[PDB]
Amino acid sequence: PNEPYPAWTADSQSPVSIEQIEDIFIDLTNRLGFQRDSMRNMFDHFMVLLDSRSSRMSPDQALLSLHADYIGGDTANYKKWYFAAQLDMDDEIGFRNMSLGKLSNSLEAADFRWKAKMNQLSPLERVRHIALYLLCWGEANQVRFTAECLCFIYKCALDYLDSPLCQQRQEPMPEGDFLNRVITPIYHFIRNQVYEIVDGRFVKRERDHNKIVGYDDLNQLFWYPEGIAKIVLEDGTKLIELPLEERYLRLGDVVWDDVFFKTYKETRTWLHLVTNFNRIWVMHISIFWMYFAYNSPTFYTHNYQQLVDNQPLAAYKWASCALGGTVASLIQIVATLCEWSFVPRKWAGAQHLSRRFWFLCIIFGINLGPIIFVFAYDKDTVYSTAAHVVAAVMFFVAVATIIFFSIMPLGGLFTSYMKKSTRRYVASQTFTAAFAPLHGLDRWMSYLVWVTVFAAKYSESYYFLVLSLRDPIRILSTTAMRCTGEYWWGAVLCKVQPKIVLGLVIATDFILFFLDTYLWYIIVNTIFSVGKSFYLGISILTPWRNIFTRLPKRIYSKILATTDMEIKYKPKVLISQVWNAIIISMYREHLLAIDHVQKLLYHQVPSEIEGKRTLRAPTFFVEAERRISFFAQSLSTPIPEPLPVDNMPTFTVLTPHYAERILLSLREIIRETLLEYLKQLHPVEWECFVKDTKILAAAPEYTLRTRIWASLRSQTLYRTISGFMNYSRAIKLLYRVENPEIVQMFGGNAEGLERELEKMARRKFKLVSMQRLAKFKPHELENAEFLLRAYPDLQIAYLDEEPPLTEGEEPRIYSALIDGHCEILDNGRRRPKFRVQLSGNPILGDGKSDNQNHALIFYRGEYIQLIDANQDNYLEECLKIRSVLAEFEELNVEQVNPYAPGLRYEEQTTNHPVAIVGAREHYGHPDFINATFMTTRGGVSEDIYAGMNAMLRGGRIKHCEYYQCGKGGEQMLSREYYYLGTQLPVDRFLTFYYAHPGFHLNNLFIQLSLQMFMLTLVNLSSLAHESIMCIYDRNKPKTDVLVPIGCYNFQPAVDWVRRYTLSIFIVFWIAFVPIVVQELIERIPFSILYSRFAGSAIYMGARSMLMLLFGTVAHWQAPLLWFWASLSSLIFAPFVFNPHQFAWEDFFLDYRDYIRWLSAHRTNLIMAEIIPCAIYAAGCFIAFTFINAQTGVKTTDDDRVNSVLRIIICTLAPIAVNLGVLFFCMGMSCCSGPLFGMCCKKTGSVMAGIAHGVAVIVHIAFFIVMWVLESFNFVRMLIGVVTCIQCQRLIFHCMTALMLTAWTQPSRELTAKVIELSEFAADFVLGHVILICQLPLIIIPKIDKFHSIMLFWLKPSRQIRPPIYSLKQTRLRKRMVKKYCSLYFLVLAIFAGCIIGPAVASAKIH
Amino acid sequence: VLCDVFGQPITQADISNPTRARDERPLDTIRSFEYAVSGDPVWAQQLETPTYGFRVRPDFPVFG
Ligand SMILES: [Mg+2]
C-alpha cells in the first residue's frame, strides 16, 4: 500500500527491482539518442504492464509471458518476420500448415536452436530486449502502420548495440538523432507522393490511384530476402554488403525513391469478379450444360422427328454430356489469364502462373481428345462397342474433373508436383494464409449444412428443368413458319423467329438457375437454427414472472464473485446493496417518481429486537421497464464467473472528437424553440425535474441546471462522457461490497474510506483526443474547462505547434497530454504531462485513423474499447465488465514455460489467440481490442478491413450475447478479397461468399432476369399476334392434327409464362419477407423524393412498363395482371406514405418547389462493355421488323418494302436539332457575355425547353406517319418507340465510351451537353407523367380524414399546429396556389390535346 | 520565472517540454504525479535527482 505499483514493488519475490529497470532505460537513451520525455512515457507504460500482469500470477511468470508475447514466442510477430525473411522458410511453413492434421538445415532444427537460445537468458536481458522495442515503437510516428519496417529497424539497432563500436565509444550520441536520421526520410517519402508545393502551400495533387505508393506497398518489401537486397546507398553500394554492425550508422544515407514500387494494381471490376470467385461458376455452368445437353436430342439426331420417335444412338448421348469437363477446364484457364495483370511480372512469386498454365492446358487437351475421336465419322458410319466404352469412361472422367476443380482452391493446385527451388506460392503464406482452424461439432456442422443445401438444390432444379423445357424446345426447334421473306436480305428474316424465341427462353432459364441456391441456403439455415434450440433448451412459453422470480439468485451467483469468499454473510444482505444501488441510480436520472421507488426497494422497517426480521424482500419479487426487462433476460444465459476486483486487469476507453458540441448554448435553448420541443417529447421527466428543483432551491445555477438538462437529452459530448463514467462507480461499489472487513477497519472515518476507494478505482480504469484544442473559439475553451472541473480524472490529448527554430523552415509539431490535476499557468493554460515531437503534420489522409494514431501512445493497460462521439451506457451494463474481459481466454489459464526443450509445435495449445470481441443484441464491427496482439501488427483501424486483417494474420473473432452497445460497398476491389477468395477452403469460402457479396449479386441477377423476360415476352407476343393459333389440352393423344388446318403449336410457350411468373413471384415473396418482419413490428418535398429513387428502378421501370403494355395489347395472357399490379405498386408506393400529400396547399407548394428545382491494351478493355446494349437493341429491332414483315398472311412475291430508314431518321433527328440549337447559341454573341446577361442569364434553360418540345413533337410525328396506314391499329407504334429510345441510349453510351479513352475540348463539352439535354428532356416528361396520375385522389374531399386515420396506426400519432405567420404570407400563398393550379391545368390540357388531336386526325386524314 | 512542483526553481529547460527540468529522472516524475493528487510532504523528501544526476548509478553491470 501507498506505493506506485503494488503488485510488483510490494512483493518480495520480484526478480528485478524498479531501480534496476530505470537504469536500463537511461542507458539505452544515452547510447541511442532517444528523446527523454518519450523515455519517461515508455517507462510508465512498461511499469503499468508489469503491474497489470502481476496481479493474477507470479512476477517470474509475468515477465516470461511478456517476453514470449513480444519477442520470442510463437505468438510474436518478430519471430515470424525473422523466420520468413532471414532464414527463408516460408515454403516450409506453408507446407506444415497444409498438413497439420496428419502431424497432429530444416524448420525443426531451426526452431530447436531458437528455443535453446531463448531458454538461457537472464531477466535483465529480457528487460533490455523489451525496453528497446518499446522505445523504438514510441517514436515511429506514421511508421507504426508498417510493422515489418519497424522490425527491420529494431534488428539493425540490436545488432549495432552489442558491437565494440558502441561499447568503446566515449561520448553519448546527441539527443534527437534517431528521429532526425531514420524516421524523417521515410515520412518525407510518404508525404511527397500525395502533396506538391505551390505558392508555398501544400496542395493535394491528383493522379490515378495506381501511381500512389500506399502503406501496404512499403510493408511488403520487407517480406522477402530479395526485397532487402534492393536497398541502395547514395554512392551506389548495397546495404547488405556491409557487415552487420555498421548497417545502422549508414541507415540515414539510403535514397528511398529508388527502392519502393507498386505491388498490386487494379483493373475493370468484372476481371476481379471472375478471378476471385472462380469456384462457383465452375459448379453452376458445368452442371447446367450437362442438364441441358441430356434433354435436347434434336440437335444431334439424324432426321429427327417426334412422330417417328427415332432416338439418337446412346454413344452420342454419352459423348455430348461429357463436354462438361471442357467447360470447367476452360474457365480455370480464363481465370488464370486474368490474374496475370494484377501482379508485377518480376516480383517474387509471379512465376507460379506460367507453371500452372501448362498443367491446365494439358488437362484441357486430355478432356478434349477422346470426344473428338468419338464424334469422328469413321466410327459414326460403322458402329463399335469400343466407342461406347470410351464414352462411358469419358463421362466419369468429366465428373471427376468437375469435382476436382470445384473443391480445391485456385492457390495451391499443383504445389507438390513442381518440387522447384523457385517460389512455389503466389503470396506469402506466413502473412496471408494463417487461418485458424475449427474444432469440435462446429466443424462437422459446416460440412453437413452445405452438403444438405447442394443435395436439395441439384435434385430440385432437375425436376422443374426436365419438364418445363422439354416440350417448348421440341415444338420450337422443328416448326417452320414459311414465307417469301424480304428480298433485301432474303427469307431469313422470318424463318428464324421461333429459334430466336427458343434461344431467349434458354437464356432466361440460365439466369433463373442462379436464384435457387440462395433460397435453399436461407431455408436450411432457418431450419437448423430452429432445431438447435431444442439442444440449447430455449424456452419461450415460460411466463415472465418465472424469469423475474429467479433474479436474486442469478444476481448472487453471476454478478458477485462470492465463490472465493468464506461464507460469513447471508446472500440477501449482499443482493440488497446492489438492487438498491441500481434503483436509486435510476431515480436520480428523473426516470421514476417518488411513489414508484418504495414498490421496489428493500426495507429496514420491521422490528430489530430479532435479527431475522431485519430485512424483507420487495413486492416486485413475490425506459426503466425496458432496461429492467433486458437485464433480467440477459442474466438467464450462461455467464463466466468473475474474478475479485483486486485481480482484474487494466483497460482504457478511447474517443475521437472533431467539431462536435460540448454543451448547448442559451441561444440553442431559447431560440428556434428547442426547449418546447424537448418538453413535448419528454413531459414526465420535465415535471420530475421541476419538482426536484424547488427541493434544493438571471438565476445562474438554475440556468446551468437547465443547460445540463437540455444537453443530456441531445447529441453532445457531455452526454457520452457522463454515460461512460459509470465504470468507476461500479468498480467502487463492487470493491466495497465484496469485502466488508476493509469497511469495518476504518471505524466511521468516511473520508479515508472514500480516498481508498478512489485510489483503487484509478488503477483499473483510464482518454479523449481533441486535435483542435489549440484552435478553439473562446466559448469552446470555456466549455472544455468545464469537463476538467467536473471530472478531474479525464485525460485530453491535442496537437501543438511552435515557430521554426531556423528562419524560413517548416514549423515544429508536438503532441501533448493534460488532465484535471494539472497546475494552471498564469497564461490560462494547463501544464502538460508529456510533450513528444513529431516529424511533421500527422493528418495526411482524411478519417479518424490519423486522429487515433497520434493519441495511441498514451494508452495504458491490456484491453481497449473503441467508441464514437455519440454513444450511451448504463450502470447495469457496467456491472458485467469483469465477465466480458473473460471472453479473451487469458484470465484463468495454466502457466507453462514456452521454451521447454521437449515441446513440439503441434502440441502447443496457445497458437491462435483471440483478437476481437464484438457485442450483439464471423465478421463484425469491433468493440473490444486485444491491445498487445493488435498494436504489434499495425494500427487499430476501416472496421471490416481490420477484421479481415486480423483473420488473415491468424487471430479469432468472437461474439458476446449478454452485452449491448449503445450505438445510435462497391469499393471492395482490394487485396483482402483476392487473398480470401483464392486461398480459403471450400466450406469457409462458401460461408463467406453467401453472406457479404452474394446478396449484391442476387440483387443484380433479379434485375437482369426481369429485363430478359421482358424481351422474351415482346418477341413471343409478336410471334403469337402474327401466327394463326390453335388451342388444346393435356388430354391430347400422342399425335393428331388440330381442327384448324395448318396452324402452328404455341401453347407450351404460353404455359412457360405462367410457370416463370409463379417462380418469380415466389422469389419476390421470399425476398420481401424480411422487410415485412422489420416493418410490421413498429405499429419531404417531391423533388428530393424523386431524386432519391432517380436512377433506381424508375427509368428501367418505365421502360419495362412500355414493353409490358405492348405485350398486353398485342396478345392477352392471364398472368400479366400480376406484373401490372407489381409494377404499379413499385412505382406508386413512395408517394402513399408521404404525410399530408392529399392537401391542395401542400400539393401545389411541392409543385412550385419541383418546378423551381428544375429552374495500350486498355483501349479494347474499356469498350468491351458495349456489347450488352447492342444485343438488346438488336433484339428490339428484330421484334419491331417481324410485324412489318407481314409473315402471318400469304406473302406476295418479289415485292420489296422496308422501314429501316424511318428508324434512322427517328434516332438521328433530335440529336441534329440539338446540335443546331447549340450552334445557334454559339452564333448569338457567344463572344460577348453582356448580351446573354441582359437577355437570359440562364439562357441554357431556353434551349432545354426547346429540346424537350421538339423531342415531344418528333414522337407526335412518329404517331402521325404511322397511323397514316393504321386508322384503327395501335400495337405497331410502341415497339418502334422502344427501339428508338434504345438506339438513343446505345449512341450515348458509345459516345461516352469513346470520350473516356481550337474546338477540340469544346467538342468534348458539347458531347457532354448533348446527352445532358436529352436526359433533362426525359426527366421533364417523366415527372409530369407521375404527377397527373394522382389528380383524382386529391379531388375527393374525404381523403383527408382517411389519411388522418393512418396517424392512429403510426406509433407517435402526435401533431402540433404550425407556427403563426402574417397575413401577407397567406395572400402570397393563395396567389401562388392560383398560379400553379392554372399552370398544372394548362400542362394537363396540352398533354390531353397531344393524344386527342391525332384521334380526330385518323378519321379526317386519308 | 518558471518553477517546478515543490517550488524548487529550474535553470536548464528540456528540449521537448519547456516546463520540465532537463536532468529529472523518471521516478521523480512518478512521485510528482502522485503528489499532484494528494498533498503529502513525504513525497518531496524522497527525491534523488541532484545526488545522482541523469547518469547511470555506479556498479551498473556490463552487457555485450
Ligand atoms: Mg458497437
Swiss-Prot record, chain A:
Disulfide bonds: none annotated. It catalyses: [(1->3)-beta-D-glucosyl](n) + UDP-alpha-D-glucose = [(1->3)-beta-D-glucosyl](n+1) + UDP + H(+). It is found in: Mitochondrion; Cell membrane. Induction: During vegetative growth. Expressed periodically during the cell cycle. SMART domains: FKS1_dom1. It is an enzyme of class 2 (transferase). The chain crosses the membrane at residues 280-300, 318-338, 357-377, 389-409, 447-467, 504-524, 1061-1081, 1093-1113, 1118-1138, 1166-1186, 1207-1227, 1249-1269, 1278-1300, 1383-1403. Changing residue 749 to S: In 1144; temperature-sensitive mutant; lower beta-glucan content of cells. Changing residue 127 to N: In 1082; temperature-sensitive mutant; no gross alteration in beta-glucan content of cells. Keywords: Cell membrane, Cell wall biogenesis/degradation, Glycosyltransferase, Isopeptide bond, Membrane, Mitochondrion, Phosphoprotein, Transferase, Transmembrane, Transmembrane helix, Ubl conjugation. Changing residue 295 to K: In ACR79-5; selectively resistant to antibiotic arborcandin C. Its main location: mitochondrion. Changing residue 430 to I: In 1093; temperature-sensitive mutant; higher beta-glucan content of cells. This is 1,3-beta-glucan synthase component FKS1. It comes from Saccharomyces cerevisiae (strain ATCC 204508 / S288c) (Baker's yeast).
Curated annotation (Swiss-Prot), chain B:
One of its GO terms (cellular component) is cellular bud tip. One of its GO terms (biological process) is regulation of cell wall (1->3)-beta-D-glucan biosynthetic process. Keywords: Isopeptide bond, Phosphoprotein, Ubl conjugation. It comes from the Eukaryota. To yeast YGR273c. Present with 10800 molecules/cell in log phase SD medium. This is Uncharacterized protein YMR295C.
